[PDB]
Amino acid sequence: PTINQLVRKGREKVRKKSKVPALKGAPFRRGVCTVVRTVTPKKPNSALRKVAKVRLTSGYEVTAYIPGEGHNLQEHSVVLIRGGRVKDLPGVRYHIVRGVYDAAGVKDRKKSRSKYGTKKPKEAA
Amino acid sequence: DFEEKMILIRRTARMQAGGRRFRFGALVVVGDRQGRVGLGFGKAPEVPLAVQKAGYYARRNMVEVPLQNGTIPHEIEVEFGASKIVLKPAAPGTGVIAGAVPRAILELAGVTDILTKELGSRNPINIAYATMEALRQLRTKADVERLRKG
Amino acid sequence: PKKVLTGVVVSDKMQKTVTVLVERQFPHPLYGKVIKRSKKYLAHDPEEKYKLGDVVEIIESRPISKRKRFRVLRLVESGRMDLVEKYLIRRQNYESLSK
Amino acid sequence: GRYIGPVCRLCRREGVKLYLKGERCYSPKCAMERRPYPPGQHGQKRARRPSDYAVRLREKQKLRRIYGISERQFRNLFEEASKKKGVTGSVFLGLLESRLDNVVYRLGFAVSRRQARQLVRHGHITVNGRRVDLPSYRVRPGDEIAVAEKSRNLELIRQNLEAMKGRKVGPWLSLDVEGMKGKFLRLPDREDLALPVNEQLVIEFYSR
Amino acid sequence: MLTDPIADMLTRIRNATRVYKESTDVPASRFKEEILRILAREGFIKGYERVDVDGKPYLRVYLKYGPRRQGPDPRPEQVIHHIRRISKPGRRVYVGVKEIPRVRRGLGIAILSTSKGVLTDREARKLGVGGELICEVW
RNA sequence: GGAGCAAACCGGAUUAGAUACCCGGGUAGUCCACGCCCUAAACGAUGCGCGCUAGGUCUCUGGGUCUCCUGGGGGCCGAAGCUA
RNA sequence: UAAACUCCUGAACCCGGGACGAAACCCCCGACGAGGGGACUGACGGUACCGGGGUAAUAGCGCCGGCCAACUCCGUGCCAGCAGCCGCGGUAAUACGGAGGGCGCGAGCGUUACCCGGAUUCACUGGGCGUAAAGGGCGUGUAGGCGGCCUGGGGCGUCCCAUGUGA
Numbered sequence: 001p002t003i004n005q006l007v008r009k010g011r012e013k014v015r016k017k018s019k020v021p022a023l024k025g026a027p028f029r030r031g032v033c034t035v036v037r038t039v040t041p042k043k044p045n046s047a048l049r050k051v052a053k054v055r056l057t058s059g060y061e062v063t064a065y066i067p068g069e070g071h072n073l074q075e076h077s078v079v080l081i082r083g084g085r086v087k088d089l090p091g092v093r094y095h096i097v098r099g100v101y102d103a104a105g106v107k108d109r110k111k112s113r114s115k116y117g118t119k120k121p122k123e124a125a
Numbered sequence: 126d127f128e129e130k131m132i133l134i135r136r137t138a139r140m141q142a143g144g145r146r147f148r149f150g151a152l153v154v155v156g157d158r159q160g161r162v163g164l165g166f167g168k169a170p171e172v173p174l175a176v177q178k179a180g181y182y183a184r185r186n187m188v189e190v191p192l193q194n195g196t197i198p199h200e201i202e203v204e205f206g207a208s209k210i211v212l213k214p215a216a217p218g219t220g221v222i223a224g225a226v227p228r229a230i231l232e233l234a235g236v237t238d239i240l241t242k243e244l245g246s247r248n249p250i251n252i253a254y255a256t257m258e259a260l261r262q263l264r265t266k267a268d269v270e271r272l273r274k275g
Numbered sequence: 276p277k278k279v280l281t282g283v284v285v286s287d288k289m290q291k292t293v294t295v296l297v298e299r300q301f302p303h304p305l306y307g308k309v310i311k312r313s314k315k316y317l318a319h320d321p322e323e324k325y326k327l328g329d330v331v332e333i334i335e336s337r338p339i340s341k342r343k344r345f346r347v348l349r350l351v352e353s354g355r356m357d358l359v360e361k362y363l364i365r366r367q368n369y370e371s372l373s374k
Numbered sequence: 375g376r377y378i379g380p381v382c383r384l385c386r387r388e389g390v391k392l393y394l395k396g397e398r399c400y401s402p403k404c405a406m407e408r409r410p411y412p413p414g415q416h417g418q419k420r421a422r423r424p425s426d427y428a429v430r431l432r433e434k435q436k437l438r439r440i441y442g443i444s445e446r447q448f449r450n451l452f453e454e455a456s457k458k459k460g461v462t463g464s465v466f467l468g469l470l471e472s473r474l475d476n477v478v479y480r481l482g483f484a485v486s487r488r489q490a491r492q493l494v495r496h497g498h499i500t501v502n503g504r505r506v507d508l509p510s511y512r513v514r515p516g517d518e519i520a521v522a523e524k525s526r527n528l529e530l531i532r533q534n535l536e537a538m539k540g541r542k543v544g545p546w547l548s549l550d551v552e553g554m555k556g557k558f559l560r561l562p563d564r565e566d567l568a569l570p571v572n573e574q575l576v577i578e579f580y581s582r
Numbered sequence: 583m584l585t586d587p588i589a590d591m592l593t594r595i596r597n598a599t600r601v602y603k604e605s606t607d608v609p610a611s612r613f614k615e616e617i618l619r620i621l622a623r624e625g626f627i628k629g630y631e632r633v634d635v636d637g638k639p640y641l642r643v644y645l646k647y648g649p650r651r652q653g654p655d656p657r658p659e660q661v662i663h664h665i666r667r668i669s670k671p672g673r674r675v676y677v678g679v680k681e682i683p684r685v686r687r688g689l690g691i692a693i694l695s696t697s698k699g700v701l702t703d704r705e706a707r708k709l710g711v712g713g714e715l716i717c718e719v720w
Numbered sequence: 721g722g723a724g725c726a727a728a729c730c731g732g733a734u735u736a737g738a739u740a741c742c743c744g745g746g747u748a749g750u751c752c753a754c755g756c757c758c759u760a761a762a763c764g765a766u767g768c769g770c771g772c773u774a775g776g777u778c779u780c781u782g783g784g785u786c787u788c789c790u791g792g793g794g795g796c797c798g799a800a801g802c803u804a
Numbered sequence: 805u806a807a808a809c810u811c812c813u814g815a816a817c818c819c820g821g822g823a824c825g826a827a828a829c830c831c832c833c834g835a836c837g838a839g840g841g842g843a844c845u846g847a848c849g850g851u852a853c854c855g856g857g858g859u860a861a862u863a864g865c866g867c868c869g870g871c872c873a874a875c876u877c878c879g880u881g882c883c884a885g886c887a888g889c890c891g892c893g894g895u896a897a898u899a900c901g902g903a904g905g906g907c908g909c910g911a912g913c914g915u916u917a918c919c920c921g922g923a924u925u926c927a928c929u930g931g932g933c934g935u936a937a938a939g940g941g942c943g944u945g946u947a948g949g950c951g952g953c954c955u956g957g958g959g960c961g962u963c964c965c966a967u968g969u970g971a
């Protein structure tokens with residue numbers, strides 16, 4: 001646009017939209033499981049994906065993914081949520097953090113252990 | 126004989142009754158690291174032959190690069206189609222700061238100290254052709270004087 | 276220095292006061308273009324001497340009323356009813372922007 | 375803490391022979407004279423054309439691994455050289471070569487930078503009379519780098535100072551061999567060193 | 583009505599040169615003449631002169647090019663590679679002497695209007711002044 | 721105001737079905753005046769004004785010393801140049 | 805060369821000394837001033853630091869399909885799972901899980917969240933609108949923006965010098 005036009009109107013700064021009301025941006029939010037269901041993916045994937053509907057302190061009831069080999073979560077479970085969509089599961093915008101509150105960490109996990117939250121094993125160590 | 130760096134190779138494909146039919150392209154720079162570079166683009170049914178073809182084409186396509194202590198006389202912007210390249214002089218100790226494509230070219234022309242920026246279409250082929258024009262278009266205090274006499 | 280400004284009397288409806296429209300111009304901070312802008316000052320005229328159209332200077336002053344902080348220093352030149360027209364039209368345009 | 379782990383093993387991998395053991399990484403093996411290829415199961419197989427990144431990465435790993443310094447400390451040195459006046463490549467090397475741990479090794483008092491490190495740490499070294507146990511200490515020019523009188527009797531200091539019988543020391547250094555004390559006359563130019571490293575690639579690596 | 587005669591002049595030049603014209607006329611202005619003087623002194627043009635076209639003041643302006651060139655397209659190199667207004671009616675640009683730019687590391691000019699007359703960057707920097715940044719030519 | 725045409729609608733065909741395409745009817749409407757509505761593939765899908773940069777060819781409309789020259793307008797091919 | 809093993813040094817820990825921070829207030833001489841003399845005062849702390857002795861004495865976390873540095877064997881069979889984006893998994897998976905090996909950082913390494921960057925993707929520097937998003941359906945014209953050539957006056961913009969201010 002002309003200069004006179006920029007002077008009259010100016011440019012508009014672009015507001016960035018949050019992908020995540022773990023409400024106030026706050027890196028983690030604690031909640032209570034409600035339904036611990038299994039959901040099928042979409043698009044070109046097939047599996048039985050493990051999921052918690054979570055009541056939060058933040059007020060929101062949201063659905064979260066339970067990552068890892070297998071889990072120990074039932075209907076009143078109390079867990080920490082972290083954010084991280086799942087992408088094959090629509091409306092699943094958060095993961096549960098394993099190793100915190102009533103989500104025990106993944107047993108038998110040798111490799112990327114600190115996600116999944118499983119302490120150092122002790123046979124050759 | 127010069128050095129011969131290969132920037133980009135890709136496989137293209139044309140359609141024919143019962144199936145796709147592949148060709149290969151290769152972008153190759155060749156240069157001595159002392160004011161001569163050449164850019165060559167060569168296509169052929171096999172990668173090998175295309176790279177070779179490209180180097181050949183690159184030698185038939187060279188350029189005066191007026192270095193001045195590992196860098197260039199001045200700043201130049203060159204638009205080639207939708208790809209724009211800017212080229213800026215730098216003191217020594219800077220390095221060649223540039224993306225994969227213009228860097229390979231600037232390296233083999235013996236530029237050692239130069240600030241660049243790709244603007245526009247970041248298409249390798251076209252970025253390379255702009256870089257060549259950009260070098261191609263460099264003048265020095267010398268030639269400019271010569272141009273302005275009468 | 277008590278600030279001295281200069282502009283144009285565009286009202287004398289009040290007793291012992293004139294309204295003075297004062298232009299200021301300057302580069303735009305980003306876009307560089309020189310832009311005009313203006314502001315009205317209520318100025319103290321204890322002798323209702325100055326009238327519509329006059330260019331005056333205006334000087335920073337000890338307060339006289341709420342929002343009257345300037346006195347009329349001197350006449351610069353009379354006439355300028357053109358500039359007053361400028362203001363008055365700009366003003367009546369306003370009624371053509373409502374609903 | 376600094377690396378701690380197999381050494382004439384990046385003597386390998388990095389292609390070039392790095393001198394991280396001094397006496398042996400010097401004589402029918404930096405392990406390198408026996409196996410001139412990367413460590414691990416794949417070491418001897420057709421290496422793939424390296425990405426511009428791989429290259430620049432490697433060159434900086436080379437330079438860093440030579441001086442035995444950590445990434446954080448290496449990095450800050452680079453950033454310091456960048457602010458400073460003059461060819462930012464050499465300057466860095468200037469600074470890297472000004473580390474007491476290095477000077478001590480350049481001065482022959484130790485056979486390895488790693489071993490020089492231990493000498494400096496355990497109090498065996500003295501700058502300008504006062505003693506100093508910081509490997510990172512910036513030796514400036516003029517500085518006399520002595521050995522600790524108390525430490526002189528030690529087999530190790532003896533051998534190394536005795537094998538410096540014949541030996542010649544870099545142009546930026548001097549060395550009274552008997553008084554077991556050297557000097558730091560000025561900081562080295564790029565040309566003064568013969569490092570297997572093109573720093574133009576290192577500066578480049580720290581550009582993105 | 584013609585909003586910027588200087589931009590006009592410059593552009594007449596830009597255009598005539600791109601087809602290797604021997605000359606262009608441009609309606610005459612004292613200000614225009616002063617810019618040409620610089621232009622001529624710096625060897626961008628051959629020179630210029632006052633003339634009448636339909637009995638009205640112009641400035642014929644003798645353009646100047648490289649030699650014939652070699653391969654396909656033997657069109658001469660151009661002397662005025664680039665010429666370009668800066669300050670314009672829409673947006674005046676003024677500089678202090680500390681912020682007069684170096685045009686193409688000095689292989690290029692910037693013409694520049696000051697209270698000590700129209701000047702190139704160098705002339706004006708040594709003369710220690712700035713002013714309206716008219717145009718840059720390389 | 722209403723000849724002709726014709727959404728809707730009333731019928732005939734066609735079709736697996738045919739709330740259509742085809743045929744036969746047919747009201748609003750299409751027409752006029754006055755007052756509303758204010759939309760569009762309201763398209764050159766191209767804001768207005770001004771200067772500058774080869775030509776060739778066909779056309780509408782002025783003027784000249786009317787073979788040719790010189791205005792204004794509508795097309796086609798194309799210098800330089802621009803364009804994904 | 806990593807280990808075992810051979811020499812060598814000696815973090816921790818034990819013994820000893822042991823701070824600077826504090827010279828004033830005050831008192832005496834001089835005059836209750838200048839100057840001079842004198843005495844007290846340490847939470848940190850038996851700490852820092854110096855000296856003697858002295859033990860080989862912690863390593864983890866992420867990653868290895870491409871972007872991106874690092875590849876193989878097994879297990880698994882559109883399952884279990886991974887997933888920043890592209891996408892992996894349907895019996896030979898460098899993409900899942902484990903192993904070996906490798907890369908990167910290292911008392912840290914990863915994760916999530918938030919800001920700027922890259923993004924010349926609000927474009928002043930520095931973008932666009934025939935067909936990609938984008939020319940207002942067209943006019944008339946208000947405010948506003950912009951304004952041909954010559955001379956003179958003022959010096960508001962603009963430029964210059966000096967100076968105050970910018971803790």
Ligand SMILES: NC[C@@H]1O[C@H](O[C@H]2[C@@H](O)[C@H](O[C@@H]3[C@@H](O)[C@H](N)C[C@H](N)[C@H]3O[C@H]3O[C@H](CO)[C@@H](O)[C@H](O)[C@H]3N)O[C@@H]2CO)[C@H](N)[C@@H](O)[C@@H]1O
Nearest residue numbers: 001002667670766767802803927930931932933934938939
């Ligand atoms: N986008 C096409 C048209 O632009 C028109 O106006 C624009 C064009 O006439 C012209 O823009 C030119 C462009 O023609 C031509 N292709 C070259 C030039 N790059 C452009 O110029 C523009 O962009 C450059 C930066 O790219 C600026 O530096 C320059 O000042 C600006 N005029 O000047 C106007 C600046 O935007 C009309 N708005 C309208 O017809 C349509 O939007």
Ligand SMILES: [Mg+2]
Nearest residue numbers: 044045046882
């Ligand atoms: Mg799948």
Ligand SMILES: [Mg+2]
Nearest residue numbers: 204206207208
């Ligand atoms: Mg473009």
Ligand SMILES: [Mg+2]
Nearest residue numbers: 244245246247
């Ligand atoms: Mg793009």
Ligand SMILES: [Mg+2]
Nearest residue numbers: 412413414417
């Ligand atoms: Mg190996």
Ligand SMILES: [Mg+2]
Nearest residue numbers: 594597598606
């Ligand atoms: Mg012209």
Ligand SMILES: [Mg+2]
Nearest residue numbers: 678679680964
């Ligand atoms: Mg100033």
Ligand SMILES: [Mg+2]
Nearest residue numbers: 731732733740
């Ligand atoms: Mg019918």
Ligand SMILES: [Mg+2]
Nearest residue numbers: 726743744745
């Ligand atoms: Mg009908």
Ligand SMILES: [Mg+2]
Nearest residue numbers: 725726745746
């Ligand atoms: Mg009918």
Ligand SMILES: [Mg+2]
Nearest residue numbers: 764766794795
């Ligand atoms: Mg048209």
Ligand SMILES: [Mg+2]
Nearest residue numbers: 792793794795
């Ligand atoms: Mg015509």
Ligand SMILES: [Mg+2]
Nearest residue numbers: 379380381805
């Ligand atoms: Mg060892």
Ligand SMILES: [Mg+2]
Nearest residue numbers: 812813814858
């Ligand atoms: Mg011992």
Ligand SMILES: [Mg+2]
Nearest residue numbers: 425872873874
């Ligand atoms: Mg790789």
Ligand SMILES: [Mg+2]
Nearest residue numbers: 111112115886
């Ligand atoms: Mg993983």
